[PDB]
Design an enzyme around this catalytic site. Structure first.
Site, PDB file in Angstrom:
ATOM      1  N   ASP A 131       1.061  -1.363  -0.053  1.00  0.00           N
ATOM      2  CA  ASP A 131       0.165   0.257   0.030  1.00  0.00           C
ATOM      3  C   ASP A 131       0.750   1.250   0.140  1.00  0.00           C
ATOM      4  O   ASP A 131       0.460   2.518   0.394  1.00  0.00           O
ATOM      5  CB  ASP A 131      -0.832   0.025   1.021  1.00  0.00           C
TER       6      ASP A 131
ATOM      7  N   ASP B 242       8.163  -3.964  13.862  1.00  0.00           N
ATOM      8  CA  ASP B 242       8.862  -2.758  13.586  1.00  0.00           C
ATOM      9  C   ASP B 242       8.974  -1.964  15.142  1.00  0.00           C
ATOM     10  O   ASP B 242      10.011  -1.415  15.334  1.00  0.00           O
ATOM     11  CB  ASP B 242       7.858  -1.740  12.687  1.00  0.00           C
TER      12      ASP B 242
HETATM   13  O1  LIG Z   1      -1.961 -11.569   7.214  1.00  0.00           O
HETATM   14  C1  LIG Z   1      -1.170 -10.373   6.810  1.00  0.00           C
HETATM   15  C2  LIG Z   1      -1.618  -9.248   6.728  1.00  0.00           C
HETATM   16  C3  LIG Z   1      -0.643  -8.495   6.205  1.00  0.00           C
HETATM   17  N1  LIG Z   1       0.377  -8.369   5.444  1.00  0.00           N
HETATM   18  C4  LIG Z   1       1.342  -7.433   5.116  1.00  0.00           C
HETATM   19  O2  LIG Z   1       1.828  -6.610   6.041  1.00  0.00           O
HETATM   20  C5  LIG Z   1       1.978  -5.450   5.506  1.00  0.00           C
HETATM   21  C6  LIG Z   1       1.197  -4.476   6.472  1.00  0.00           C
HETATM   22  O3  LIG Z   1      -0.087  -4.661   6.530  1.00  0.00           O
HETATM   23  P1  LIG Z   1      -1.344  -3.597   6.657  1.00  0.00           P
HETATM   24  O4  LIG Z   1      -2.806  -3.885   6.615  1.00  0.00           O
HETATM   25  O5  LIG Z   1      -0.988  -2.323   5.529  1.00  0.00           O
HETATM   26  O6  LIG Z   1      -1.052  -2.995   8.121  1.00  0.00           O
HETATM   27  P2  LIG Z   1      -0.372  -1.733   8.852  1.00  0.00           P
HETATM   28  O7  LIG Z   1      -1.340  -1.118   9.799  1.00  0.00           O
HETATM   29  O8  LIG Z   1      -0.075  -0.548   7.767  1.00  0.00           O
HETATM   30  O9  LIG Z   1       0.870  -2.324   9.801  1.00  0.00           O
HETATM   31  C7  LIG Z   1       1.959  -1.374  10.418  1.00  0.00           C
HETATM   32  O10 LIG Z   1       2.521  -2.445  11.245  1.00  0.00           O
HETATM   33  C8  LIG Z   1       3.190  -3.424  10.455  1.00  0.00           C
HETATM   34  C9  LIG Z   1       4.088  -4.378  11.565  1.00  0.00           C
HETATM   35  O11 LIG Z   1       2.843  -5.303  12.425  1.00  0.00           O
HETATM   36  C10 LIG Z   1       4.201  -2.759   9.693  1.00  0.00           C
HETATM   37  O12 LIG Z   1       4.775  -3.973   8.918  1.00  0.00           O
HETATM   38  C11 LIG Z   1       3.600  -1.875   8.751  1.00  0.00           C
HETATM   39  O13 LIG Z   1       4.671  -1.327   7.877  1.00  0.00           O
HETATM   40  C12 LIG Z   1       2.944  -0.734   9.642  1.00  0.00           C
HETATM   41  O14 LIG Z   1       2.457   0.142   8.737  1.00  0.00           O
HETATM   42  C13 LIG Z   1       1.358  -5.118   4.064  1.00  0.00           C
HETATM   43  O15 LIG Z   1       2.599  -5.321   3.147  1.00  0.00           O
HETATM   44  C14 LIG Z   1       0.615  -6.542   4.015  1.00  0.00           C
HETATM   45  O16 LIG Z   1       0.379  -6.950   2.700  1.00  0.00           O
HETATM   46  C15 LIG Z   1       0.947  -9.862   5.441  1.00  0.00           C
HETATM   47  O17 LIG Z   1       1.898 -10.140   4.879  1.00  0.00           O
HETATM   48  N2  LIG Z   1       0.091 -10.970   6.232  1.00  0.00           N
HETATM   49 MN   LIG Z   2      -0.577  -0.435   5.678  1.00  0.00          MN
END
Ligand SMILES: O=c1ccn([C@@H]2O[C@H](COP(=O)(O)OP(=O)(O)O[C@H]3O[C@H](CO)[C@@H](O)[C@H](O)[C@H]3O)[C@@H](O)[C@H]2O)c(=O)[nH]1
Ligand SMILES: [Mn+2]
Length: 342
Positions: free
Chosen positions: A108, A186
């Site tokens: 994203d 993170d």
């Molecule tokens: O079951 C899952 C769900 C999500 N993702 C990936 O994880 C990333 C982050 O997912 P997202 O839904 O966008 O969540 P965020 O709230 O943006 O997550 C926050 O927290 C994450 C760690 O928990 C970090 O990796 C992110 O950069 C940070 O923005 C993306 O590349 C997704 O495709 C997976 O690999 N597996």
């Molecule tokens: Mn995100």
């Protein structure tokens, strides 16, 4: 050196927007192979990635089983899955593909026109300065009115690991993999046990922006902060610039001298735009309460991770406020972060 772009995907078909921009700006397929690691097994997203053909390498996280979480984490299964995917994907990049480094990009994120130019130019710095452990495209306080649009080339060091479009060396993965956490990767990297006092390079104007309102996490943080970080649109030829000022020995002498050499100005005067003849000032904080107070008063992110402020360097948060350069800083007697500043 070949620096792959590792795109982390799951179940959002909007990974199309991410790949479209990466592929559009990529200056070389040979130097920047794109590897899309997809978790979740979402068919539509799988079809979108596959449609790109040989423009990308599509790999799939093998273990789609549910994860047994700890008692305090029933609501956070998604964070465990993210951590598992990162471990597998990064392992593929450094163990299977055996690349020397990688730029991690979540599905994203939309990249800036000079995203590749930026990492091409900073890879050598990261490779040569052990006090740095990453190069990030993200400015945590990068909202439009808080950055100097006339200095798209300006870079900084930061003790706060920003993630969101970041470069790491295989050397670092060798260090982190053995102790990779079960969740919240993170925030885990932000702890001193992992950071070990190392910094990342970050820009005045972010080279990534996020459009993922709907995600693993609920949307308040994205809605009130993340969505407002401005994407750089002016191409800067970083590979043609002298980035030696970022080496620790130069930065800690020069940048700190600049900060503490700047006149101190009361936060209220900065806020009301008083004393405009002072184009660059220091707003000093002396405790956790003054820091959060002053940060909020000036529109800066006020949360702390392991005692480190967003985009902070030796406790200093640098930004633009109504056209003025402001350094929200601690007294020059600063000598370390305190994790109890929560
Ligand atoms: O079951 C899952 C769900 C999500 N993702 C990936 O994880 C990333 C982050 O997912 P997202 O839904 O966008 O969540 P965020 O709230 O943006 O997550 C926050 O927290 C994450 C760690 O928990 C970090 O990796 C992110 O950069 C940070 O923005 C993306 O590349 C997704 O495709 C997976 O690999 N597996
Ligand atoms: Mn995100």
């Amino acid at each position: 050196a070949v620096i792959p772009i590792l795109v982390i995907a799951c179940d959002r078909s909007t990974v199309r927007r991410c790949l479209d921009k990466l592929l559009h700006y990529r200056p070389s397929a040979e130097l920047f192979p794109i590897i899309v690691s997809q978790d979740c097994g979402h068919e539509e997203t799988a079809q979108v990635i596959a449609s790109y053909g040989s423009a990308v390498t599509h790999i799939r996280q093998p273990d789609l089983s549910n994860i047994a979480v700890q008692p305090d984490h029933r609501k956070f299964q998604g964070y465990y899955k993210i951590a598992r995917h990162y471990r597998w994907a990064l392992g593929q990049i450094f163990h299977n593909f055996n690349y020397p480094a990688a730029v991690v990009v979540e599905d994203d994120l939309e990249v800036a026109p000079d995203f590749f130019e930026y990492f091409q130019a900073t890879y050598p710095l990261l490779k040569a300065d052990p006090s740095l452990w990453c190069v990030s495209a993200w400015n945590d306080n990068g909202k439009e009115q808080m950055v100097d649009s006339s200095k798209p080339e300006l870079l900084y060091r930061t003790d706060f690991f920003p993630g969101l479009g970041w470069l790491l060396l295989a050397e670092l993965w060798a260090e982190l993999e053995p102790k990779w956490p079960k969740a919240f990767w993170d925030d885990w990297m932000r702890r001193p046990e992992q950071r070990k006092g190392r910094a990342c390079v970050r820009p005045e104007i972010s080279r990534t922006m996020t459009f993922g309102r709907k995600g693993v996490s609920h949307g308040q943080f994205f809605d009130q902060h993340l969505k407002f970080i401005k994407l750089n649109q002016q191409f800067v030829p970083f590979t043609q610039l002298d980035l030696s000022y970022l080496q620790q020995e130069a930065y800690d002498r020069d940048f700190l001298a600049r900060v503490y050499g700047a006149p101190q100005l009361q936060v209220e005067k900065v806020r009301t735009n008083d004393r405009k003849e002072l184009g660059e000032v220091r707003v000093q904080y002396t405790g956790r309460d003054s820091f959060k107070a002053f940060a909020k008063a000036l529109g800066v992110m006020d949360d702390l991770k392991s005692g480190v402020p967003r985009a902070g360097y030796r406790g200093i948060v640098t930004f633009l406020f109504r056209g003025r350069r402001v350094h929200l800083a601690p007294p020059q007697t600063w000598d370390g972060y305190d994790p109890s500043w929560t």
